[PDB]
């Protein structure tokens, strides 16, 4: 006989709209963080976790929809933030550029026509080489030919903050606490939580910054280790500390581009010109690669491993591309990953102001100067690597060569968010009994 039971502890897989949560920092410095929609609820103090005894669940990081949701949420926020900011199309006029290490910074003069009086106003600004394209040595800004360039708004910070994702009511998040989970498969010691740990939405292309660490060992995860087209996510158990700076003592200039809007550029640089170099401890870096190679030897045929440099000619793939303060650094990492494992480090960088962020082509973002001497530091917590594989040669190599890889920027989140799965609760069902 059928008996109906309501309040039954059963869940099924589901995908839903997720909620944010954040610390109520309330800085109130008249600078809003772009993450202004992150405060839909304060971070729950004393969050709980309940272990479910004898529950086995299948987790799949490669198909994880929370990763896909995070991507949509970050893009949406960026577009909303930049939407109302000043267009820089009045600056697509022909530039007359001369030098100010040689040729890295150029002094460009131009005729701007949007001055209120509707008569030409001569103006000048300093620009970094990466934003200037040749077109007799005349120049134009690199993205004017294809898209609208907008200036990021003053008083909006884009500093990453920890953000916790929370289940909507009626849903729950299951967390995988198994050790050496690795991927695509059963996990024991599954617990239920309301909110995830905080994840800092830090964007980079090669070396993952300010993430979580593996608890016991370096862990290497991949959807498929024989499919040479897949990205291998490597999580470290110790952070490698990286420092970086852009020492030029920049002084900012402001151009009256439109009645209600100002355009900001570097006006002049005081003192000497130096490269925006980064500093990695040699010992920690070398030991980290040693450990990665060891774990790769266990995963792959136990043969010699080598790490090689970036491939391709695309700056967003070949260089690190991290956001430090208000600047975009494009650091040369070929200094790293130049060794074979068979058993300070200075990285030069460039500064670029016009960014094809998220590889969209409708618009580009412009980064204003931040008055010189910018210093930051961060934790290297993991790497995005690919194996080169190769053509079907007749056993011509006993060494597996790996290289830094980048693009997509989804693994930046997947590497931490993979422990979480979303399910829905459907507390209604029936069972046999002795009845009417």
């Amino acid at each position: 006989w059928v008996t109906v039971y309501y309040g039954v502890p059963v869940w099924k897989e589901a995908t839903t709209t997720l909620f944010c949560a954040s610390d109520a920092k309330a800085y109130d410095t008249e600078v809003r963080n772009v993450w202004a929609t992150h405060c839909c609820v304060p971070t729950d103090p004393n969050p709980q976790e309940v272990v479910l005894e004898n529950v086995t669940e299948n987790f799949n990081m490669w198909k994880n929809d929370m990763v896909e949701q995070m991507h949509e949420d970050i893009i949406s926020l960026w577009d909303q933030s930049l939407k109302p900011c000043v267009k820089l199309t009045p600056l697509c006029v022909t530039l007359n550029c001369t030098d100010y290490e040689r040729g890295e910074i150029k002094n460009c003069s131009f005729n701007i026509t949007t001055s209120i009086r509707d008569k030409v106003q001569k103006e000048y600004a300093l620009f970094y080489k990466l934003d200037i394209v040749p077109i007799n040595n005349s120049y134009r800004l690199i993205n004017c030919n294809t898209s609208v360039i907008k200036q990021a708004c003053p008083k909006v910070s884009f500093e990453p903050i920890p953000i916790h994702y929370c289940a909507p009511a009626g849903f729950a998040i299951l967390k995988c606490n198994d050790k050496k989970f690795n991927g695509t498969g059963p996990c024991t010691n599954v617990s239920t939580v309301q909110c995830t740990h905080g994840i800092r939405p830090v964007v980079s292309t090669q070396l993952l910054l300010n993430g979580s660490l593996a608890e016991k060992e370096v862990v290497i995860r991949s959807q498929n280790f024989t499919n040479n087209a897949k990205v291998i996510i490597v999580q470290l158990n110790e952070s490698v500390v990286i420092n970086c700076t852009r020492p030029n003592n920049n002084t900012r200039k402001s151009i009256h581009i439109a009645p209600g809007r100002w355009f900001y550029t570097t006006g002049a640089i005081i003192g000497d010109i130096r490269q925006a170099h980064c500093n990695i401890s040699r010992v920690k870096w070398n030991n980290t690669l040693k450990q990665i190679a060891t774990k790769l030897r266990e995963q792959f045929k136990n043969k010699t491993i080598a790490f090689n440099q970036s491939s391709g000619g695309d700056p967003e793939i070949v260089m690190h591309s991290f956001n430090c303060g208000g600047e975009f650094f494009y650091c040369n990492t070929t200094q790293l990953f130049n060794s074979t494992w068979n058993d300070h480090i200075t990285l030069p960088c460039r500064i670029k102001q016009i960014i094809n962020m998220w590889q969209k082509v409708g618009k580009a973002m412009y980064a204003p100067p931040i008055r010189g001497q910018i210093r930051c530091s961060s934790n290297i917590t993991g790497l995005l690597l690919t194996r080169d594989g190769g053509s079907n040669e007749n056993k011509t190599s006993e060494t597996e060569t790996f290289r830094p890889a980048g693009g997509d920027m989804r693994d930046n989140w997947r590497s931490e968010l993979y422990k979480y799965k979303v399910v829905k609760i459907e507390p209604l069902g029936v069972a046999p009994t002795k009845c009417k």
């Binding site: 059928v2 039954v8 869940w11």
Partner: protein
Amino acid sequence: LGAAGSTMGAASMTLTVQARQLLSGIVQQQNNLLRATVWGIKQLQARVLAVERYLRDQQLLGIWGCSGKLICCTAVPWNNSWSNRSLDMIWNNMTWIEWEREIDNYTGLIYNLLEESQNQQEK
């Protein structure tokens, strides 16, 4: 809200207490008032669906003649074609998750039978 891996007997024992927490409100007290353009429309959609789920469960239980109750004995006999297992093993070897999966393909049928047999009660 644990004991998910426990047997059906163990989990349904004192189902009511567990159920009161699950059913304290979908959102408990409007997300315990803690939470009191596109972001807005997505949240309205989420809130509306939560309301519909609540009402659908209450409506279906009401149709079946189960109201103000969590556990109801109905007029529909168990058909062994849905499942033919010892009463004891489903209750003390199987968990609720395993059970719901085991008879997932009979959900529409059982529910339809319950509506017809429970509606035909003179009223």
